[PDB]
Write a protein that binds this ligand. Structure first.
Ligand code: NA
Ligand code: NA
Ligand code: NI
Lengths: 159, 157
């Protein structure tokens, strides 16, 4: 099956941030993702460490415990922006942040991700992840919440 | 970076499970780890995917969202077992599960880890992680909770 790129990856705070979409998926636990039959796509945020990542991740590692909010808007057209929170999950090609999304038909869409670090008050995983701070094994502070945007042309499941 | 081994790694459920320890650490958020000055070691569970991991992890990837309990027993042995829950955290060499621990002096110890998958009701990370189940991108079910044990000799510091 086809995985569609959403623009080109952007590099910030020692991380590569990429956006992709595919057909809606099914996930355990059930009842968290919007039903696949009631969705158009499964949108994903692919976040991996660059070389010399300041938070201690080896190059290519998945960056875990982040919280991602998205806003998808049909470019210059009728309809409200489509918003939601991604969920961390694993697939046959590894761990991703993603969500099943219902769109507003074929056309151009803006896609914006707002990426929250593990220590952000909005991130629900903040009580469950730490960062070493001692001189010997410590790392630099977490990045501050930031956004990245792209656009893509949605045509459906016409493959 | 210098760490000390606790026995040798064990391969189970498509994962390499290793136990290591180093000097006590400091962590953000503060006040969660036992104070470094009140600890002897920082104990770690190093868990990485093997080749053909059944849950979709590429070989060498850190296995995230696990919940790990530990029990450390001094072989003879007048003290109570040392117990705790590890916390996931990142250090200059990458992410680990770890905890600051106060031991019961030099000697031989048994170390047992109980590893909970990310869908276990006992695991507080379970509400935050999922697994694709569709034919095209899906993975095999999570492993069942299991334990691993090692012996090691502690001499300080
Ligand atoms: Na496009
Ligand atoms: Na703090
Ligand atoms: Ni996904």
């Amino acid at each position: 099956m086809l995985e569609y790129p959403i623009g080109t990856p952007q590099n910030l705070a020692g991380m590569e941030i990429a956006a992709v979409y595919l057909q809606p998926i099914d996930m355990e636990p059930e009842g968290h993702m919007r039903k696949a039959s009631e969705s158009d796509i499964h949108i994903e945020a692919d976040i991996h460490a660059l070389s010399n990542n300041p938070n201690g991740y080896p190059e290519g590692f998945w960056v875990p415990f982040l919280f991602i909010k998205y806003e998808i808007t049909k470019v210059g057209g009728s309809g409200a922006p489509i918003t939601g929170d991604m969920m961390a999950m694993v697939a046959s090609d590894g761990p991703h942040y993603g969500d099943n999304v219902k769109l507003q038909g074929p056309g151009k869409y803006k896609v914006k991700y707002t990426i929250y670090p593990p220590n952000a008050k909005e991130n629900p995983m903040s009580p469950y992840y730490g960062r070493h701070t001692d001189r010997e094994t410590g790392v630099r502070p977490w990045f501050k919440t930031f956004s990245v945007e792209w656009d893509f042309t949605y045509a459906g499941i016409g493959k």
